[PDB]
Amino acid sequence: SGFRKMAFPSGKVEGCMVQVTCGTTTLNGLWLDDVVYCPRHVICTSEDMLNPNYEDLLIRKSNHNFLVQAGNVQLRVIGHSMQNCVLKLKVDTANPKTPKYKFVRIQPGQTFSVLACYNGSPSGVYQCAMRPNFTIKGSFLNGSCGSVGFNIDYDCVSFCYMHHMELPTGVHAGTDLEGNFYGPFVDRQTAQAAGTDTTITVNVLAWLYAAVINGDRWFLNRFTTTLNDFNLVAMKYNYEPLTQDHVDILGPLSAQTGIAVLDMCASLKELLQNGMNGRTILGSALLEDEFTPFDVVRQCSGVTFQ
Amino acid sequence: SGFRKMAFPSGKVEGCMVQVTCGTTTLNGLWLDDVVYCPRHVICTSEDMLNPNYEDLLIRKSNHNFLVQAGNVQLRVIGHSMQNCVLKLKVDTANPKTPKYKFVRIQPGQTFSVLACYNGSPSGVYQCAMRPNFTIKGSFLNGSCGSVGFNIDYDCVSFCYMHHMELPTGVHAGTDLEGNFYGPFVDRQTAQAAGTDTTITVNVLAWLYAAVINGDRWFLNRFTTTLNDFNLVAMKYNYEPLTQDHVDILGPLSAQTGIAVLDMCASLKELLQNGMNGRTILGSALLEDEFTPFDVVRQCSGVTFQ
Ligand SMILES: [Zn+2]
Ligand SMILES: [Zn+2]
């Protein structure tokens, strides 16, 4: 028992991190097979980032201007190309530690683990969600660009995020591994405002199920509701609307606990309207929304990887 | 910027986990050099755990009754011995993935990362603290015994915890890697009550410094206090007393921010007495106490490992 915000074991990803230097700019790259992926703004100076024309800047770079180091050993760059907002550097050596992998573009509300790196070296691992405004709330200091987010399914790593930017408000933006930004953001140092950061309702409900499974039961009430009635309350509190697809996804947690999804919605409605009155759920005084229904099933049943 | 509960990258520890089976009991072991460490209750049945005499139970086991599997490959056990509450199984092969390591016994308030494992396979990684009552609040399901907690300093893994027990209240107890329990707990299925779980004051203060560094400033007030005056309030709220040693440890955070430690104590005193009034700090509605002062310096400056 117990319930923790848990990241995926990071070993398979640690073996893929390298340092990429272009001129005086160093950040992280991801080495899979004989390709290294990194943010294209490795080619920029601090001055360039105010208004970069990446195609024109890239004309001035050749393979030998990209310095790639894996541990203490230099890799030879034999080609380079730009795809959307990422650079692909072809090297002459396949990474011997390449895991089974795929590239996925996730949806808001999905969770993943981030391996924060500096100078190609892993610093730490944590779990976060893609927010509904397509930002993440991470922990990234200068030098962390090119750190990646991932999920693992048994032995296959699904890479879903590469870190590129901190907005002036201190939240984070980045791309999938095809180089397309999540959200409307661009890799330029300009004013970019994020939209409303709504709470991910289906994740809150999953976490309430986890709470019941682990013995935190005080918030269960005598009421039920309907989807439409619940969504009227959700909208008032800047919660995402719940759909029947979400209800279907929570089915296994409902069956395990015997608490109908709409009954749990009515418990959540009363927590929104009355508050927590100074009590906690699973050690939180807020309603937690960075566990998906699959995260809860996984942690509550003990799924493993290798 | 941003501030996250972050675990150490787990790769160096993933390479050390194995499955140990004795009879019908399977749990995790730690393979370092040519020794595998596991909880001694691997030799028990469910019935035995009510009142085990481990020396008498162990007389009935020989090397070949201990089945050790690393991945898909069986290891040959050539000796076994019991040290306190751990079994040491000598194998005929040194783990080729053995990292630089040490065994440390930590103090309450210290934080470490847990690699939760089942059947020798890593499931997830999370960060926790040793509570002042010598329990941890983990996420452990049946089969997770023998999972370990660790800290990393550059390239050296310091192992500090091995998981053995869940108390009837749902909190967790275990040993250092010499097999000595943290706290008064024993490896028997009997009623064992935990003492007061007080809040780790020096960790709260460190986290308030992290909040200031990252721009959460609303709780800073116009007051100061003294150690003795603060400790009178701390005792009333089941906070650990603050000592000059703690003040000394917070010195670098005080110097960086320009906020004297006793001034921060006075801010904390007003948060304890008045509450948060519905606001948050670093995304929490509680006062967080599982970051040490070293955790904060580390994360706020970007220290790496390899
Ligand atoms: Zn950057
Ligand atoms: Zn056990």
XYZ file of C-alpha atoms and ligand atoms in Angstrom:
614
model
C 0.000 0.000 0.000
C 0.847 3.687 -0.196
C 0.737 5.859 -3.282
C 3.602 7.950 -4.625
C 4.297 10.179 -7.594
C 6.574 7.739 -9.363
C 8.794 8.114 -12.429
C 9.849 5.380 -14.772
C 13.292 3.873 -14.110
C 15.628 5.974 -16.161
C 18.477 3.615 -17.037
C 17.442 2.956 -20.612
C 17.308 6.695 -21.276
C 20.539 7.517 -19.367
C 22.452 5.460 -21.913
C 21.238 7.695 -24.739
C 22.231 11.108 -23.467
C 25.103 13.037 -25.034
C 26.460 16.581 -25.027
C 26.177 18.651 -28.208
C 28.185 21.827 -28.672
C 27.923 24.302 -31.530
C 30.209 27.291 -31.189
C 29.776 28.514 -27.649
C 26.365 26.858 -27.050
C 26.186 23.477 -25.254
C 23.056 21.503 -24.485
C 21.888 17.869 -24.463
C 21.268 15.468 -27.273
C 19.561 12.081 -27.595
C 21.644 9.333 -29.333
C 19.517 6.550 -30.853
C 20.993 4.248 -33.515
C 23.371 6.484 -35.527
C 21.402 9.734 -35.111
C 21.655 12.415 -32.381
C 18.567 14.624 -31.908
C 18.888 18.037 -30.289
C 17.112 21.420 -30.259
C 17.918 23.451 -33.363
C 18.711 26.503 -31.238
C 22.068 24.883 -30.433
C 23.166 26.951 -33.466
C 22.126 30.258 -31.896
C 23.938 32.794 -29.818
C 22.061 34.541 -27.023
C 21.724 37.479 -29.409
C 20.429 35.223 -32.202
C 17.556 33.938 -30.030
C 15.752 37.294 -30.138
C 14.930 36.900 -33.833
C 16.545 33.820 -35.397
C 16.290 32.776 -39.032
C 17.296 29.189 -38.569
C 17.739 28.288 -42.220
C 20.113 31.200 -42.731
C 22.023 30.443 -39.547
C 22.393 26.809 -40.460
C 23.976 27.581 -43.845
C 27.044 28.727 -41.894
C 27.509 25.361 -40.147
C 29.223 22.217 -41.403
C 29.355 18.730 -39.876
C 32.631 19.527 -38.097
C 31.090 22.515 -36.280
C 28.868 20.103 -34.280
C 30.779 18.578 -31.383
C 29.144 15.481 -29.917
C 30.555 13.798 -26.794
C 29.236 10.607 -25.194
C 30.900 10.292 -21.859
C 34.529 11.131 -22.498
C 34.504 9.958 -26.138
C 33.931 12.153 -29.200
C 31.548 11.023 -31.956
C 32.171 11.791 -35.629
C 29.380 13.739 -37.323
C 28.868 12.690 -40.930
C 25.659 14.550 -41.776
C 23.142 17.005 -40.415
C 19.611 18.054 -41.249
C 16.894 20.194 -39.688
C 13.412 18.719 -39.173
C 10.941 21.275 -37.810
C 12.554 22.499 -34.577
C 15.064 19.695 -34.117
C 18.468 18.998 -35.558
C 19.332 15.445 -36.594
C 23.078 14.781 -36.524
C 24.124 11.584 -38.265
C 27.147 10.029 -36.576
C 29.377 7.215 -37.712
C 28.646 4.983 -34.694
C 25.360 3.436 -33.640
C 24.724 3.798 -29.946
C 25.394 0.325 -28.535
C 23.006 1.067 -25.685
C 20.082 1.952 -27.965
C 16.865 0.528 -26.420
C 13.725 -0.503 -28.244
C 12.033 2.825 -28.830
C 9.372 4.805 -30.542
C 8.468 8.466 -31.003
C 4.983 9.453 -29.813
C 3.119 12.746 -29.728
C 1.023 12.794 -26.585
C -2.214 14.587 -25.754
C -2.806 17.083 -22.894
C -3.440 15.277 -19.673
C -0.930 12.543 -20.401
C 1.897 12.041 -17.931
C 5.519 11.168 -18.591
C 8.917 11.095 -16.874
C 11.642 13.719 -17.486
C 15.329 12.950 -17.175
C 16.826 16.363 -16.433
C 20.358 16.550 -17.840
C 23.205 19.077 -17.956
C 26.202 18.747 -20.278
C 24.990 15.299 -21.322
C 24.940 14.041 -17.707
C 21.766 12.951 -15.904
C 20.794 15.018 -12.887
C 17.446 13.693 -11.780
C 14.181 12.199 -12.788
C 10.650 13.378 -12.101
C 7.112 12.882 -13.339
C 4.886 15.497 -14.880
C 1.818 15.983 -17.080
C 1.280 17.794 -20.337
C -0.972 20.633 -19.220
C -4.128 21.489 -21.165
C -2.466 24.709 -22.344
C 0.449 22.587 -23.804
C 3.011 23.701 -21.233
C 4.703 21.533 -18.606
C 5.648 22.609 -15.113
C 9.187 21.310 -14.891
C 12.516 21.939 -13.202
C 14.948 23.116 -15.846
C 17.994 25.335 -15.402
C 20.252 26.786 -18.088
C 21.941 23.967 -19.931
C 18.995 21.546 -19.635
C 17.654 22.045 -23.166
C 17.477 18.752 -25.005
C 16.483 16.812 -21.907
C 13.710 14.385 -22.828
C 10.411 13.020 -21.524
C 9.430 9.432 -21.967
C 7.170 6.568 -21.009
C 8.167 2.893 -20.869
C 6.047 -0.136 -21.860
C 7.947 -3.247 -20.691
C 11.107 -2.925 -22.773
C 10.110 -0.163 -25.205
C 10.815 3.524 -24.497
C 8.326 5.941 -26.026
C 9.955 9.364 -26.296
C 7.384 12.123 -26.271
C 9.068 15.399 -25.260
C 12.301 17.312 -25.784
C 12.835 20.476 -23.738
C 13.389 23.724 -25.630
C 12.122 26.846 -23.819
C 11.165 28.576 -20.535
C 8.441 31.128 -20.991
C 8.752 34.461 -19.163
C 6.214 33.160 -16.657
C 8.485 30.278 -15.667
C 6.618 27.363 -17.283
C 8.175 25.168 -19.931
C 7.623 24.402 -23.594
C 9.098 21.893 -25.979
C 8.589 19.609 -28.910
C 7.938 15.985 -29.791
C 10.883 14.126 -31.293
C 9.804 15.082 -34.803
C 10.480 18.642 -33.766
C 6.943 20.006 -33.634
C 6.132 22.176 -30.619
C 3.354 21.203 -28.277
C 1.023 24.166 -28.377
C 1.504 27.429 -30.270
C 4.986 28.157 -28.998
C 8.036 29.013 -31.103
C 11.766 28.740 -30.417
C 12.320 32.474 -30.153
C 12.974 34.703 -27.120
C 9.787 36.694 -27.435
C 6.728 37.283 -25.306
C 4.651 34.131 -25.411
C 1.697 33.858 -23.081
C 0.109 30.564 -22.036
C -3.648 30.064 -21.983
C -5.730 28.809 -19.075
C -4.148 25.939 -17.121
C -7.284 23.940 -16.340
C -7.320 20.926 -14.036
C -7.340 17.510 -15.688
C -10.615 16.116 -14.301
C -10.221 12.479 -15.391
C -6.833 12.352 -13.618
C -8.280 13.795 -10.431
C -10.972 11.115 -10.463
C -8.399 8.386 -11.001
C -6.420 9.679 -8.022
C -9.569 9.693 -5.862
C -10.011 6.008 -6.779
C -6.356 5.416 -5.734
C -7.155 7.146 -2.445
C -10.066 4.838 -1.750
C -7.965 1.763 -2.623
C -5.344 2.920 -0.117
C -7.796 3.688 2.675
C -8.376 7.437 2.412
C -12.162 7.417 2.358
C -13.457 10.446 4.260
C -14.552 12.393 1.119
C -16.983 9.708 -0.123
C -20.494 11.140 0.146
C -24.148 10.073 -0.199
C -24.777 11.761 -3.547
C -24.588 11.104 -7.242
C -24.793 13.381 -10.286
C -24.991 13.357 -14.085
C -22.335 14.167 -16.642
C -24.062 17.384 -17.586
C -24.662 18.501 -14.001
C -21.062 17.717 -13.051
C -19.647 19.547 -16.069
C -21.527 22.717 -15.096
C -19.630 22.698 -11.803
C -16.359 21.708 -13.472
C -16.509 24.640 -15.861
C -16.981 27.073 -12.948
C -13.792 25.799 -11.289
C -11.656 25.681 -14.499
C -11.812 21.828 -14.639
C -11.752 20.092 -18.022
C -15.149 18.706 -19.096
C -15.659 14.975 -18.547
C -16.769 12.879 -21.520
C -18.115 9.388 -21.838
C -14.703 8.381 -23.176
C -13.281 9.379 -19.795
C -16.033 7.457 -17.969
C -15.117 4.378 -20.054
C -11.438 4.746 -19.204
C -12.235 4.769 -15.452
C -14.314 1.591 -15.734
C -11.712 -0.783 -14.279
C -11.227 1.437 -11.221
C -14.968 1.659 -10.766
C -15.314 -2.135 -10.983
C -12.466 -2.796 -8.556
C -13.784 -0.411 -5.889
C -17.491 -0.778 -6.523
C -17.901 2.992 -6.713
C -19.767 4.138 -9.822
C -17.973 6.833 -11.777
C -20.847 9.303 -11.436
C -20.949 8.748 -7.669
C -17.245 9.643 -7.532
C -18.025 12.693 -9.654
C -20.531 13.755 -6.972
C -17.857 13.412 -4.310
C -15.544 15.542 -6.388
C -18.304 18.137 -6.877
C -18.726 18.472 -3.118
C -14.947 18.805 -2.627
C -14.852 21.597 -5.197
C -17.763 23.466 -3.608
C -16.897 22.991 0.056
C -13.133 22.552 -0.044
C -11.036 20.199 2.043
C -11.739 21.962 5.359
C -8.123 21.397 6.374
C -7.973 17.667 5.685
C -5.783 15.787 3.241
C -6.049 13.025 0.639
C -3.046 10.814 0.086
C -0.960 13.421 1.854
C -2.137 16.264 -0.383
C -4.135 19.348 0.522
C -4.947 19.927 -3.163
C -6.684 17.747 -5.739
C -3.881 16.057 -7.653
C -4.149 15.809 -11.408
C -0.834 14.345 -12.657
C -1.844 10.676 -12.371
C -3.633 9.165 -15.375
C -6.074 6.252 -14.945
C -3.369 3.976 -16.414
C -0.802 5.340 -13.908
C -3.135 4.411 -11.068
C -3.878 0.892 -12.343
C -0.162 0.400 -12.912
C 0.994 1.516 -9.510
C -1.838 -0.183 -7.680
C -1.028 -3.552 -9.415
C 2.796 -3.473 -9.647
C 3.618 -3.569 -13.364
C 7.331 -3.884 -14.162
C 9.770 -3.160 -16.991
C 13.039 -4.649 -18.214
C 13.451 27.651 -12.931
C 10.736 25.495 -11.404
C 11.129 23.091 -8.520
C 10.198 19.415 -8.555
C 10.406 16.446 -6.229
C 13.210 14.721 -8.080
C 14.751 11.264 -7.693
C 18.252 10.264 -8.597
C 18.669 8.607 -12.009
C 18.237 4.944 -11.315
C 20.350 3.238 -13.974
C 23.268 2.353 -11.740
C 20.900 0.663 -9.295
C 18.769 -1.059 -11.986
C 21.823 -3.073 -12.980
C 22.090 -4.532 -9.479
C 18.609 -5.906 -8.978
C 17.946 -9.646 -8.985
C 15.164 -12.022 -7.977
C 15.710 -14.307 -4.983
C 13.460 -17.284 -4.346
C 13.488 -19.569 -1.322
C 10.829 -22.251 -1.397
C 7.630 -20.497 -2.349
C 8.765 -16.976 -1.326
C 10.148 -14.582 -3.981
C 11.388 -11.059 -3.403
C 14.203 -8.774 -4.599
C 17.897 -8.893 -3.979
C 20.796 -6.483 -4.506
C 23.828 -7.927 -6.412
C 27.090 -6.074 -5.701
C 30.441 -7.729 -6.478
C 29.878 -11.452 -5.760
C 27.324 -10.995 -2.953
C 23.501 -10.751 -3.139
C 21.785 -9.022 -0.190
C 18.133 -9.704 0.565
C 15.716 -9.650 3.523
C 16.151 -12.699 5.743
C 12.401 -13.327 5.725
C 12.816 -14.799 2.231
C 13.153 -18.043 4.242
C 9.725 -17.689 5.855
C 6.310 -18.910 4.919
C 3.323 -16.670 5.590
C 2.701 -18.823 8.659
C 6.331 -18.480 9.788
C 6.113 -14.662 9.818
C 3.808 -14.650 12.855
C 6.588 -15.861 15.154
C 9.795 -16.733 13.283
C 12.977 -18.089 14.832
C 15.290 -17.222 12.004
C 18.318 -19.166 13.182
C 16.267 -22.342 13.464
C 14.597 -21.781 10.108
C 17.897 -21.156 8.407
C 19.399 -24.457 9.594
C 17.008 -26.158 7.160
C 18.360 -24.281 4.119
C 21.405 -25.038 1.985
C 23.018 -22.981 -0.786
C 20.986 -24.797 -3.451
C 17.678 -23.810 -1.813
C 18.367 -20.142 -2.722
C 17.463 -19.442 -6.336
C 18.969 -16.239 -7.709
C 18.076 -14.981 -11.202
C 19.538 -11.908 -12.905
C 17.457 -11.251 -15.943
C 16.946 -14.646 -17.524
C 20.210 -16.127 -16.192
C 20.608 -18.179 -13.005
C 23.456 -17.430 -10.581
C 25.229 -20.162 -8.615
C 25.101 -19.717 -4.841
C 28.291 -20.863 -3.142
C 27.709 -19.616 0.405
C 25.180 -17.935 2.639
C 25.226 -16.129 5.955
C 22.820 -14.069 8.045
C 23.880 -10.609 9.256
C 21.270 -8.999 11.514
C 18.102 -8.950 9.388
C 19.704 -9.516 5.998
C 20.890 -12.581 4.169
C 24.169 -12.423 2.253
C 24.314 -14.948 -0.589
C 27.770 -15.443 -2.057
C 27.587 -16.215 -5.769
C 30.263 -17.421 -8.128
C 30.028 -14.398 -10.458
C 30.773 -10.769 -9.701
C 28.138 -8.449 -11.065
C 29.773 -6.865 -14.117
C 27.548 -3.826 -13.681
C 28.614 -3.188 -10.077
C 28.940 0.605 -9.562
C 31.166 2.385 -7.087
C 29.186 2.067 -3.885
C 29.035 2.392 -0.169
C 26.657 1.421 2.630
C 25.423 4.301 4.802
C 23.044 4.486 7.740
C 21.125 7.728 7.457
C 19.500 9.921 10.090
C 15.802 10.942 10.287
C 15.106 13.837 8.014
C 17.432 12.608 5.296
C 15.962 11.997 1.859
C 16.751 9.254 -0.624
C 15.404 7.646 -3.802
C 13.606 4.262 -3.850
C 13.678 1.951 -6.839
C 10.503 -0.087 -6.386
C 10.991 -3.569 -7.843
C 8.931 -6.742 -8.288
C 10.452 -10.113 -9.185
C 13.827 -8.439 -9.682
C 12.414 -5.982 -12.254
C 12.316 -2.210 -11.726
C 8.869 -0.654 -11.595
C 9.417 2.965 -10.707
C 11.469 5.453 -8.834
C 10.424 8.025 -6.261
C 11.897 10.213 -3.552
C 11.122 10.059 0.128
C 12.447 11.001 3.569
C 13.259 8.966 6.632
C 10.578 10.170 9.028
C 11.466 11.172 12.590
C 9.679 8.056 13.858
C 11.989 5.895 11.595
C 9.259 4.919 9.144
C 9.032 5.885 5.472
C 5.862 6.633 3.566
C 6.403 4.588 0.437
C 4.551 2.748 -2.305
C 5.194 -0.949 -1.852
C 2.984 -3.853 -2.891
C 3.463 -7.548 -2.155
C 6.649 -8.725 -3.786
C 8.519 -5.422 -3.316
C 10.563 -6.497 -0.285
C 14.257 -6.086 -0.951
C 13.773 -2.934 -2.996
C 16.428 -0.411 -1.992
C 16.873 3.293 -1.263
C 19.943 5.169 -2.308
C 21.657 8.481 -2.877
C 24.247 9.215 -5.574
C 27.349 11.441 -5.281
C 28.767 11.831 -8.815
C 29.626 8.215 -9.595
C 29.221 6.602 -6.165
C 25.927 5.037 -5.028
C 25.314 5.163 -1.289
C 22.781 2.481 -0.375
C 20.902 3.370 2.771
C 17.638 1.389 2.885
C 16.275 -2.058 2.076
C 12.514 -2.576 2.331
C 11.262 -5.253 4.719
C 7.834 -4.527 6.253
C 4.464 -2.710 6.052
C 3.068 -1.884 9.444
C -0.661 -2.417 10.050
C -1.111 1.334 9.674
C 0.222 1.262 6.116
C 3.625 2.917 6.638
C 6.879 1.170 5.858
C 9.896 -0.085 7.765
C 13.222 -1.510 6.730
C 16.897 -1.822 7.404
C 20.252 -0.415 6.358
C 22.390 -2.722 4.239
C 24.055 -4.157 7.331
C 20.644 -5.476 8.244
C 19.823 -3.267 11.217
C 16.286 -1.874 11.299
C 15.715 1.843 11.344
C 13.744 2.407 14.509
C 12.488 -0.220 16.954
C 10.822 -2.437 14.387
C 11.303 -6.188 13.977
C 10.752 -8.521 11.025
C 7.726 -10.228 12.523
C 4.013 -9.949 11.670
C 2.983 -8.486 14.989
C 1.400 -5.269 16.168
C 4.011 -2.554 15.892
C 2.936 1.021 16.433
C 4.861 4.038 15.148
C 5.512 7.085 17.308
C 4.726 10.690 16.443
C 5.476 11.648 12.827
C 6.728 15.192 13.389
C 7.492 17.610 10.567
C 11.143 18.050 9.632
C 11.554 21.791 10.285
C 14.970 22.305 8.661
C 13.627 20.756 5.430
C 10.577 22.999 5.447
C 12.835 26.034 5.788
C 15.028 24.857 2.931
C 11.944 24.469 0.739
C 10.781 27.989 1.652
C 14.188 29.244 0.456
C 13.650 27.282 -2.810
C 10.264 28.982 -3.117
C 11.785 32.429 -2.821
C 14.496 31.560 -5.377
C 11.772 30.488 -7.809
C 9.570 33.534 -7.286
C 6.970 32.392 -4.757
C 7.332 35.218 -2.264
C 3.917 36.050 -0.809
C 4.596 34.444 2.627
C 7.628 36.636 3.441
C 6.664 38.872 6.361
C 7.992 41.845 8.362
C 8.964 39.876 11.466
C 11.858 38.006 12.964
C 12.153 35.656 15.945
C 14.672 33.778 18.091
C 15.515 30.099 18.154
C 13.855 29.658 21.511
C 10.720 31.602 20.587
C 10.392 29.704 17.307
C 10.873 26.321 18.973
C 8.007 27.041 21.382
C 5.712 27.386 18.372
C 7.278 24.411 16.595
C 6.647 22.119 19.540
C 2.951 23.102 19.597
C 2.563 22.081 15.942
C 4.575 18.799 16.198
C 7.576 20.319 14.309
C 11.089 19.127 15.147
C 13.114 21.639 17.199
C 15.603 23.747 15.239
C 19.215 23.792 16.430
C 22.159 25.973 15.609
C 23.511 23.076 13.553
C 20.432 23.436 11.352
C 20.911 27.221 11.146
C 24.515 26.596 10.012
C 23.379 24.143 7.349
C 20.974 26.744 5.879
C 23.720 29.376 5.685
C 24.341 29.109 1.935
C 20.631 29.531 1.173
C 20.474 32.503 3.496
C 23.499 34.103 1.804
C 22.174 33.515 -1.708
C 18.745 35.021 -0.993
C 19.741 37.610 1.573
C 17.064 36.371 3.963
C 18.388 35.669 7.457
C 17.491 32.238 8.773
C 15.648 33.635 11.794
C 13.610 35.943 9.551
C 12.542 32.887 7.535
C 11.700 31.168 10.813
C 9.354 34.082 11.589
C 7.651 33.629 8.234
C 7.217 29.959 8.973
C 5.813 30.777 12.430
C 3.138 32.981 10.877
C 2.255 30.274 8.323
C 1.828 27.755 11.130
C -0.378 30.078 13.186
C -2.487 31.573 10.408
C -2.402 28.857 7.766
C -2.169 29.300 4.019
C -5.605 30.930 3.652
C -6.141 28.971 0.443
C -2.898 29.919 -1.286
C -0.066 27.683 -2.420
C 3.735 27.548 -2.337
C 5.512 25.841 -5.189
C 2.223 24.219 -6.101
C 1.645 22.816 -2.613
C -1.103 23.621 -0.138
C 0.938 22.035 2.672
C 4.405 22.797 4.015
C 6.697 20.311 2.300
C 9.361 18.596 4.347
C 11.005 15.994 2.063
C 13.661 18.314 0.605
C 16.910 18.630 2.569
C 19.020 21.813 2.374
C 21.470 19.865 0.170
C 18.594 18.753 -2.116
C 17.628 22.387 -2.605
C 21.170 23.612 -3.324
C 21.606 20.700 -5.714
C 18.447 21.226 -7.688
C 18.761 24.988 -7.725
C 22.363 24.741 -9.133
C 22.141 21.711 -11.467
C 24.575 19.137 -10.070
C 25.028 16.037 -12.240
C 26.133 12.409 -11.936
C 27.783 9.866 -14.219
Zn 18.431 26.221 -24.802
Zn 8.428 -9.559 2.318
